[PDB]
Design a protein around this ligand. Structure first.
Ligand SMILES: [Ca+2]
Ligand SMILES: [Ca+2]
Lengths: 201, 202
């Protein structure tokens, strides 16, 4: 029930934006009364904040586990990029699209800002391990987020989460993120990250 | 140039608030004119928005169109296009590239904009396909170019004013990165060659 409301909200917010969307629309989309929505969420801001968090929280939690990979920065950066893109592709709606809404900057979404800042920092310092004090350390994060401009947004999931497979687009973008730094690709990178994903459970 | 002041103030409001929240009242006050004198230059905020989108997209499609037809290999041509695109995105007071991302832009009113974006995207893609063939990496160079919209300032100060004899570091970086993802080697003379090409578009 909660999951349904969040999905319907993603659909409305990605197509109409935040300002234009009412809670009335969200209730009708899900086929429930406005009262039963109010029970699960007080306002459309709370819903929006929950969506934004859902797209960065899981990857920051994952980046805890990166040091336990007994591996170099290239491998660690590849795995993070790939698993981030994996999550962005695992959803019914293109919820990553939401960060581009101008509303997101406001102080209400401070919890989201902090998580985004944490993630951005993890990407950057890993890249700095590879190229040092170079402006290219900025690129891997932006290449990762470019998938939001690539995927579908019609309710069908681009790539459902598999225990034993990474989607081609995640492999591409992760390969591309090391390529811009001039880093060589670890041969075992796909298994190694699938392994890491598996022992986050 | 009163019309131009109105368009700048509108860029500022639209990039920070979005389209829906922005009123014509705000635009008049930002510029310090009466609502009536605004109505004279523009009937609605849609007309203003459409004018902004045109102003930013037309010059870059013209740039891509012209560069795609030059006596060099695809690597050089793609590098120059990426670099000169980023150059333009960085030459403006406001981050007008940010406007593309607004969900309003998808609607049928902005069909003229959609066609220009599609044209530009196609130029980037076919140039990349000259390098890597039928590969999904042909999509990347355009997206790497547009990533500068998430990098630059948006406070009224111009990040990199247009120079006849210099490309901004960020344009060189992203252009280098766009060839790097395709595994293409960088032409040594690429910075001068593009500056030259920019110069003989005048
Ligand atoms: Ca979809
Ligand atoms: Ca600025």
């Amino acid at each position: 029930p909660r999951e349904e409301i969040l999905d319907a909200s993603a659909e409305l917010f990605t197509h109409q934006g935040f300002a234009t969307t009412s809670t009335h629309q969200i209730a009708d989309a899900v086929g429930i009364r406005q009262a039963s929505l109010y029970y699960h969420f007080p306002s459309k801001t709370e819903i929006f904040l929950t969506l934004l968090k859902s797209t960065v929280e899981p990857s920051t939690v994952l980046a805890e586990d990166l040091s336990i990979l007994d591996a170099g920065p290239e491998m660690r950066l590849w795995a993070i990029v790939a698993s981030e893109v994996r999550l962005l592709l695992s959803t019914k709606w293109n919820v990553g699209r939401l960060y581009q809404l101008p509303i997101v900057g406001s102080e209400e979404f401070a919890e989201y800002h902090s998580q985004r800042e944490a993630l951005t920092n993890i990407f950057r310092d890993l890249a700095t391990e590879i190229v040092g004090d170079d402006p290219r350390a900025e690129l891997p994060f932006h290449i990762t987020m470019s998938v939001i401009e690539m995927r579908r947004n019609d309710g069908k999931i681009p790539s459902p989460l598999s225990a034993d497979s990474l989607p081609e687009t995640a492999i591409m973008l992760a390969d591309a993120s090391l390529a811009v730094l001039g880093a060589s690709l670890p041969a075992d990178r796909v298994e190694k990250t699938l392994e890491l994903i598996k022992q986050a459970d």
